[PDB]
Amino acid sequence: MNIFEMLRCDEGLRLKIYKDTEGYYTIGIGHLLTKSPSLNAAKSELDKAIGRNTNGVITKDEAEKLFNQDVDAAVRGILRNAKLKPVYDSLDAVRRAALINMVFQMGETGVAGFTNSLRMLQQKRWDEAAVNLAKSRWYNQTPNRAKRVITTFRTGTWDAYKNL
Numbered sequence: 543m544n545i546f547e548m549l550r551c552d553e554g555l556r557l558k559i560y561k562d563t564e565g566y567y568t569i570g571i572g573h574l575l576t577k578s579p580s581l582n583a584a585k586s587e588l589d590k591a592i593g594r595n596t597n598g599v600i601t602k603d604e605a606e607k608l609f610n611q612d613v614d615a616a617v618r619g620i621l622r623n624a625k626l627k628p629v630y631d632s633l634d635a636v637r638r639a640a641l642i643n644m645v646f647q648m649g650e651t652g653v654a655g656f657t658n659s660l661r662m663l664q665q666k667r668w669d670e671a672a673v674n675l676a677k678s679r680w681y682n683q684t685p686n687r688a689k690r691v692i693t694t695f696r697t698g699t700w701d702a703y704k705n706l
């Protein structure tokens with residue numbers, strides 16, 4: 543397991559534009575295209591992202607290219623955020639992946655607002671952090687995925703992913 547395999551588990555792979563768990567147009571491995579309800583707007587974002595006139599359909603290689611960029615962007619967002627970087631730097635590599643996963647799903651600003659959970663993670667109070675992380679819209683709307691991410695923070699293991 544690693545962050546790529548982890549997010550690939552959590553996000554799936556679909557080569558045609560689809561709506562994500564929030565109803566937003568998405569493609570590939572959880573590549574968010576737009577929050578606009580306009581499919582035409584989403585297709586325009588897709589063509590811009592890929593660099594060609596797509597029919598709303600991409601290849602697996604193209605999906606993986608966007609995925610690598612999105613994982614990189616999530617790490618970059620963590621490292622340039624004054625709230626997320628200290629927590630990231632304090633974590634082991636398995637729990638770092640859990641934080642990248644959250645930023646991939648909800649964005650840097652959203653995760654940076656989890657002030658009390660972040661403090662408990664920085665303090666390495668793992669069970670308390672896990673309890674606090676579940677008191678969230680995130681957990682309520684995507685509880686199975688949030689449970690996997692939270693178990694990863696709680697244990698520092700891949701137990702929630704290695705037997706999927």
Ligand SMILES: *SC1=NC(C)(C)N(O)C1(C)C
Nearest residue numbers: 547550551552703705706
């Ligand atoms: S989890 C997971 N990742 C891949 C895509 C390799 N899978 O088939 C699972 C087991 C759903």
Ligand SMILES: [Cl-]
Nearest residue numbers: 585596597598
């Ligand atoms: Cl089209």
Ligand SMILES: [Cl-]
Nearest residue numbers: 632633664666
């Ligand atoms: Cl330490």
Ligand SMILES: [Cl-]
Nearest residue numbers: 670673674677
């Ligand atoms: Cl709490």
Ligand SMILES: [Cl-]
Nearest residue numbers: 676677678679
């Ligand atoms: Cl709550």
Ligand SMILES: [K+]
Nearest residue numbers: 553554562572
């Ligand atoms: K998805």
